[PDB]
Every structure is written in C-alpha cells, then in structure tokens.
Amino acid sequence: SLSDKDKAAVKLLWSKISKSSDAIGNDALSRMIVVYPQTKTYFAHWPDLSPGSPHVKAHGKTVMGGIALAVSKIDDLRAGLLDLSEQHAYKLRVDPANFKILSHCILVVISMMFPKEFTPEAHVSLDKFLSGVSLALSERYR
Amino acid sequence: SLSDKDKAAVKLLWSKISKSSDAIGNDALSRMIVVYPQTKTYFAHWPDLSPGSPHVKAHGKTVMGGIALAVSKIDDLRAGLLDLSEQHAYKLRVDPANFKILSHCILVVISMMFPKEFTPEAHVSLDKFLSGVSLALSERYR
Amino acid sequence: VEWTDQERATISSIFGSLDYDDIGPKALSRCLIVYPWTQRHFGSFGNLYNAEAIIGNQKVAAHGIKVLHGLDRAVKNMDNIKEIYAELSILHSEKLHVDPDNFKLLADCLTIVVAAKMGSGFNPGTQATFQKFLAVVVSALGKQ
Amino acid sequence: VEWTDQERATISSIFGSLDYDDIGPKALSRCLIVYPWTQRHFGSFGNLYNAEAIIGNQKVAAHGIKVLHGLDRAVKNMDNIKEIYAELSILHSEKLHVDPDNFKLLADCLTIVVAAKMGSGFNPGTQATFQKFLAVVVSALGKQY
Ligand code: HEM
Ligand code: HEM
Numbered sequence: 344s345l346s347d348k349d350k351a352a353v354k355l356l357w358s359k360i361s362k363s364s365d366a367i368g369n370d371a372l373s374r375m376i377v378v379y380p381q382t383k384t385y386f387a388h389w390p391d392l393s394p395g396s397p398h399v400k401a402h403g404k405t406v407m408g409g410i411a412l413a414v415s416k417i418d419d420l421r422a423g424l425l426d427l428s429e430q431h432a433y434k435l436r437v438d439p440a441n442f443k444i445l446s447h448c449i450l451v452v453i454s455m456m457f458p459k460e461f462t463p464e465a466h467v468s469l470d471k472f473l474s475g476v477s478l479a480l481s482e483r484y485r
Numbered sequence: 486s487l488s489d490k491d492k493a494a495v496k497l498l499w500s501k502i503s504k505s506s507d508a509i510g511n512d513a514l515s516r517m518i519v520v521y522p523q524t525k526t527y528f529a530h531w532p533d534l535s536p537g538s539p540h541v542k543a544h545g546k547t548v549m550g551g552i553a554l555a556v557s558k559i560d561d562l563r564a565g566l567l568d569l570s571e572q573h574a575y576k577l578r579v580d581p582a583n584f585k586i587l588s589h590c591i592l593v594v595i596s597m598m599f600p601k602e603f604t605p606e607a608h609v610s611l612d613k614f615l616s617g618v619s620l621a622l623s624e625r626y627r
Numbered sequence: 628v629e630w631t632d633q634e635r636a637t638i639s640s641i642f643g644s645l646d647y648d649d650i651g652p653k654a655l656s657r658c659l660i661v662y663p664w665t666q667r668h669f670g671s672f673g674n675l676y677n678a679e680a681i682i683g684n685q686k687v688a689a690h691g692i693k694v695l696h697g698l699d700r701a702v703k704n705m706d707n708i709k710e711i712y713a714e715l716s717i718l719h720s721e722k723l724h725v726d727p728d729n730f731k732l733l734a735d736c737l738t739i740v741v742a743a744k745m746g747s748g749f750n751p752g753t754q755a756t757f758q759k760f761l762a763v764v765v766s767a768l769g770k771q
Numbered sequence: 772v773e774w775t776d777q778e779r780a781t782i783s784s785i786f787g788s789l790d791y792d793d794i795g796p797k798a799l800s801r802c803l804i805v806y807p808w809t810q811r812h813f814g815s816f817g818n819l820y821n822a823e824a825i826i827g828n829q830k831v832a833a834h835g836i837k838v839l840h841g842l843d844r845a846v847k848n849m850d851n852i853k854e855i856y857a858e859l860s861i862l863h864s865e866k867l868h869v870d871p872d873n874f875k876l877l878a879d880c881l882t883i884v885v886a887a888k889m890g891s892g893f894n895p896g897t898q899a900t901f902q903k904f905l906a907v908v909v910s911a912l913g914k915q916y
C-alpha cells in the first residue's frame with residue numbers, strides 16, 4: 344500500500360513532469376514495442392509502430408491520461424481503474440507480465456527526461472504506485 | 486481483490502481441511518525445503534531440517550496458524566497480517582519469490598490430500614487468496 | 628544438467644503411473660481457468676468463457692493430451708531436453724509470443740493435478756525430482 | 772546469440788561512455804532500495820537501514836563498481852558470455868542462493884540509472900540493444916542454477 348509519504352512523493356513528482364506527459368507516453372510506448380517486441384502483437388492493428396509514429400504517439404498520450412487518472416485516484420486505485428481493468432484484464436487478456444514491462448519503460452523515460460527529479464526515493468514511491476496501478480489493472484482477470 | 490464468491494469458496498474449503506492443518510503445514514514446509522532447496526537457508530538456524538524434522542513439523546503448524554488468521558481476516562488481509570509482514574518483509578527480508586513457492590506447495594498438498602474438494606473453482610479462489618496473503622506479507626518491504 | 632540413475636527411474640515411474648488422457652486435459656483446463664490471460668493464445672479452440680465450458684471443451688482436452696505426449700519425449704531423452712524442444716521453443720517463444728512466466732504456471736498446474744492423482748506416492752522427494760525435470764523443460768522452452 | 776557490427780558498437784559506446792565509479796554504486800544502491808529483500812544477500816556490507824544509509828555506504832558502492840567491471844568482461848567478449856559468467860553463476864547460486872528473478876531487477880535498475888546518465892542518446896533502439904545484451908547476461912548468470 345502507498346503511505347502518505349509515498350503519495351506525497353508521487354504527487355510532487357507528477358507535478359513536475361506532467362507538462363511533458365505526451366512525450367513521456369510516446370517514448371514509453373515506443374520503448375515497450377521495440378525493446379520488448381513480444382508486446383507488438385497487442386497493437387498489430389496499427390501498421391506503423393516505429394518509435395514516434397502517429398499511432399504510437401497518440402496512444403502514448405492515452406496511456407499517460409490513464410496514469411494521470413491513477414494519480415487523481417491514488418487513494419483507491421482499484422476502484423479508480425476498474426473500467427480500464429475490464430478492458431485490459433478481461434477483454435484484451437493482456438498478460439500481466441506486460442504491465443511490469445510498461446511500468447519499467449515509464450520509469451526509464453522519466454529517469455531519462457527528469458534525472459534530477461527522479462531520486463532513489465522518488466523511484467521507490469513511483470514504483471510502488473505503478474505496482475498498485477498494475478494490480479488495479481489486474482482486478483478483472485479472474 | 487477477492488469477491489464474495491472467492492471468499493465463500495475459501496471459507497468453505499478451509500472449513501473442510503482445517504482439521505488436518507498440522508499435517509498440511511508439515512507437508513507443505515517439508516516440500517518447500519526439499520523441492521526448492523534455495524529456501525533452506527532461511528531456517529539454517531534450526532538444528533535439524535531433515536525429513537521428519539521436529540522443527541519443520543512445529544513450524545508447519547505455526548504457518549497454518551497464520552493461514553487460519555488470514556482466513557478470519559479475509560476481508561482485510563493487509564491489516565490482519567501487518568505484524569507478520571513486519572517480520573517477514575522487513576526483519577527477515579524474505580524474497581517475495583518464496584511466498585509464491587510456499588503458496589504453490591500449499592496448493593500441491595491440499596490437492597493431494599483433498600482431491601475432491603480441490604476443484605478448478607476452489608483452486609482459482611484459493612490461489613487468489615494466497616496471492617492476497619503474499620501481497621499482505623509484502624506490505625512492509627518498502 | 629546432471630541426472631542420477633534414480634532420478635531417471637523416478638521420472639519414468641511418475642509418467643508411467645499417469646493416463647495422459649486423464650491428466651492432460653486436467654492440467655491445461657486448470658491453467659486456462661486459474662491463469663485466464665493464457666486463453667489469449669487459444670482463440671481458435673472453441674468455448675473458453677467459463678470454467679464449465681473449458682472443462683468440457685474437447686479441443687482443449689486434446690491439446691492438453693498433446694502436451695503430455697510432448698513431455699513424454701523428454702522423459703525418454705532426459706540428457707537432451709534442450710535439443711528436442713528446439714522447435715517448440717521457436718513456436719512458443721517466437722511464433723506465439725508466450726511470455727515464459729506462463730510455462731511455469733502450466734508446469735505448476737500439472738504438478739497439482741499429478742499430486743491429486745498420485746496421492747501419497749507423490750512424496751516430497753518425488754516432487755523434487757519432478758520439479759527439477761519441469762524446470763529443465765521450462766528453460767528449454769525459454770528463449771534461445 | 773548472434774550480434775551485428777552495429778549492436779557491438781552500440782554496447783561498446785554505452786559502457787565506454789560511463790564512469791563506472793559513478794554508475795556502479797547508483798545501480799546497486801537503487802536495487803537495494805527499490806527491491807529491499809535483496810539486502811538479505813549483503814549481510815557483511817554494513818548499514819542498509821534506509822536509502823540515505825545505502826547511498827552513503829562505501830562497501831556497497833565498491834561492490835557496484837565491481838559489478839560494472841564484471842559486465843565489462845561481457846562487453847569485451849560478447850560471443851563468450853555464457854562461458855565467462857559460469858563461475859559467477861555458481862557464486863550467486865551456491866554462496867548466496869539468490870533467486871534468479873532478482874538478476875532482472877538489478878539489470879532494470881542499471882537501465883534506469885544509465886538512462887538518466889545518458890539522456891536522449893539512450894534512444895529506443897539503443898535501449899533495445901542494451902536489453903538484449905543484459906538478457907544474455909542474466910541468462911548466463913542463471914545457467915548454473
Ligand atoms: C501502466 C499500465 C497501462 C496503462 C495505464 C494503460 C492505459 C491504457 C488506456 C488509458 C487505454 C485506452 C482505453 C480505451 O480504449 O478506452 C489503453 C488501451 C489499450 N492498452 Fe493499455 N495501459 C497499460 C498497459 C498496457 C499493456 C502492458 C498493454 C499490452 C502490452 C496494453 C494494451 C492496450 C491496448 C491493446 C489498448 C487498446 C488500443 C486501441 O484502442 O486499439 N496496455 N491502455
Ligand atoms: C506466504 C506464506 C507464509 C505464512 C502464512 C507464514 C507464516 C509464518 C508464521 C505464522 C510465522 C511465525 C511468526 C512468529 O511468531 O515468530 C513465521 C515465521 C517465519 N517464517 Fe513464515 N510464513 C510464510 C512464508 C514464509 C516464507 C516463504 C519463508 C522463507 C522461505 C518464511 C520464513 C519464515 C521464518 C524464517 C520465520 C521465523 C522462524 C524463527 O522463528 O526463527 N515464511 N511464518
């Protein structure tokens with residue numbers, strides 16, 4: 344669970360990086376597809392999946408809108424992300440290993456873009472947060 | 486999260502097998518240390534780890550007492566098992582990979598001992614419960 | 628990996644006490660129920676939408692029997708498991724893009740169904756050797 | 772694992788550009804903080820009480836530097852990685868009994884600290900080659916398990 348310390352840390356970090364959310368989402372999604380190509384088949388209905396391609400850029404923004412929703416719903420991620428869970432865990436049957444992969448790519452991109460803000464303390468709180476997001480997305484598997 | 490269906494399933498199975506909890510725990514702990522001998526080092530401070538060890542038998546009872554506590558606290562495992570989490574996750578620094586190993590060994594033993602009660606449906610609910618127990622035990626890592 | 632004369636006997640003994648037609652469908656059914664994201668790989672296999680349907684599905688059943696026959700080849704050539712599973716690794720870990728976590732999950736369901744069938748004969752030492760065998764198989768199915 | 776000339780150059784450039792005395796301690800400190808059960812394997816290394824302690828711990832720092840020098844061995848022999856880490860695999864299995872899942876976690880921490888150090892030059896294709904290399908290394912480290 345997220346302590347108040349963790350929530351404060353995530354909110355402060357988000358306050359510093361949210362203006363860059365479109366770019367974060369495009370880079371993160373681009374890296375999941377090329378660094379972990381097993382995920383490409385989830386998006387095969389879009390023909391150009393190169394880094395920064397129109398569909399990747401657009402969906403990157405969508406993903407980060409889901410992260411901003413999670414920050415607003417940080418006191419109850421499971422309730423907050425229920426619809427997103429029904430889509431990912433039940434309708435799309437995304438393998439939960441892939442939630443870990445996208446979470447890792449988000450942390451790599453935030454570390455790359457905001458090295459001074461992404462301290463070891465910010466890292467452990469945001470990883471606890473992304474673990475909480477991933478578990479919330481896993482709510483409707485079974 | 487556990488649904489009312491899962492919780493009924495777990496309460497029902499436990500009510501049928503709890504009378505053999507001593508043996509379930511000895512069998513399960515015994516299997517963890519033989520089948521996954523990387524876990525032996527966690528108990529190396531006891532004088533005997535061999536098959537039939539008295540220390541293994543005694544601790545198997547202790548572990549299933551923790552399961553019995555979790556069944557009674559099934560509506561709030563994080564709080565119910567907070568003290569066990571401080572011990573496991575913070576003081577002992579148990580690798581969370583090993584919570585999955587013991588959970589698997591407990592399922593193997595219940596399957597073996599209670600094959601007609603251990604339906605695929607009982608299995609999915611009890612695995613969700615052991616996953617929640619493992620997550621509750623991981624509360625105090627970080 | 629090194630294998631002892633007793634380990635080979637033990638693996639041979641475990642598989643010879645099983646009916647693959649019984650165990651195969653039980654193991655795969657359980658995996659598709661307990662770890663239902665794995666259904667994403669079985670779209671052309673018919674009804675998967677609840678447990679009753681999966682357990683009754685004879686296409687799933689046939690496939691689980693195929694898995695047991697595929698393990699039998701390994702039982703038979705225990706020092707070359709990585710090689711005879713070469714093509715299956717490409718299948719699973721290239722053509723179907725199955726995350727390898729899932730190989731462990733299916734092996735765990737098999738262990739659970741084998742333990743119910745064998746009862747007390749599946750003692751801790753037998754389990755230990757069975758798991759050592761499955762770990763070899765899982766690795767072989769693993770990338771590269 | 773086969774390598775192209777470009778993959779070899781990319782790995783050489785990523786590691787060639789790093790100060791191992793800076794990156795090693797950060798990567799290992801972050802693993803001990805973010806995945807703190809890994810502290811169980813560092814019992815002779817001093818204070819691991821909290822993030823400040825770990826980051827200030829020079830025994831941990833020196834060990835992180837040793838890890839990067841160990842990776843350097845694979846950088847300089849990219850076709851012999853399984854062989855060159857056979858002894859290290861035994862070390863991690865038989866002395867420490869570390870679950871191989873944790874090798875991926877330290878690699879992930881390394882990638883995060885490299886990304887912060889390298890900036891946008893750590894582009895997606897560069898990360899893909901680096902993860903490929905780290906996967907070969909992690910597979911070599913669990914082989915003796
Ligand atoms: C941090 C974890 C993730 C978040 C926050 C997230 C967020 C989102 C959001 C906000 C949507 C749009 C919902 C809608 O269409 O109404 C979406 C759709 C989607 N997600 Fe994710 N997602 C996550 C992880 C993943 C992963 C790991 C995969 C697969 C590898 C994935 C695959 C998809 C697909 C296939 C779609 C639908 C795209 C389409 O419109 O065709 N998601 N996700
Ligand atoms: C996930 C299911 C588990 C449950 C329900 C459980 C339960 C318990 C309980 C009830 C105790 C006694 C606490 C006390 O009063 O001292 C205990 C202690 C302990 N557990 Fe577990 N445990 C679990 C998993 C594990 C695992 C996976 C390991 C390591 C492989 C482990 C290692 C230990 C150790 C080393 C102690 C203390 C032994 C001593 O007294 O020296 N536990 N556990």
Ligand code: HEM
Pocket residue numbers: 665666668669693694696697698715719723725729730731733734764765768
């Ligand atoms: C780790 C234990 C496993 C073993 C020994 C195994 C074995 C087999 C074998 C022998 C075949 C038949 C090959 C053929 O006739 O072409 C097969 C096919 C297949 N396996 Fe597995 N498998 C394992 C795990 C899994 C898992 C975990 C999944 C997915 C969740 C998976 C998905 C598939 C699919 C989709 C096919 C057939 C493709 C099709 O007919 O459309 N397997 N497997």
Ligand code: HEM
Pocket residue numbers: 809810812813837838840841842859862863866867869873874875877878908909912
């Ligand atoms: C990518 C994964 C890893 C790599 C490349 C790696 C590399 C190394 C190297 C090169 C050494 C010996 C250094 C020297 O003496 O020159 C070493 C030792 C050690 N490693 Fe790792 N390591 C990995 C993961 C881990 C993890 C995940 C843990 C803990 C959970 C760990 C714990 C240790 C410890 C405690 C030692 C010292 C053992 C001794 O010699 O007494 N390592 N590792």
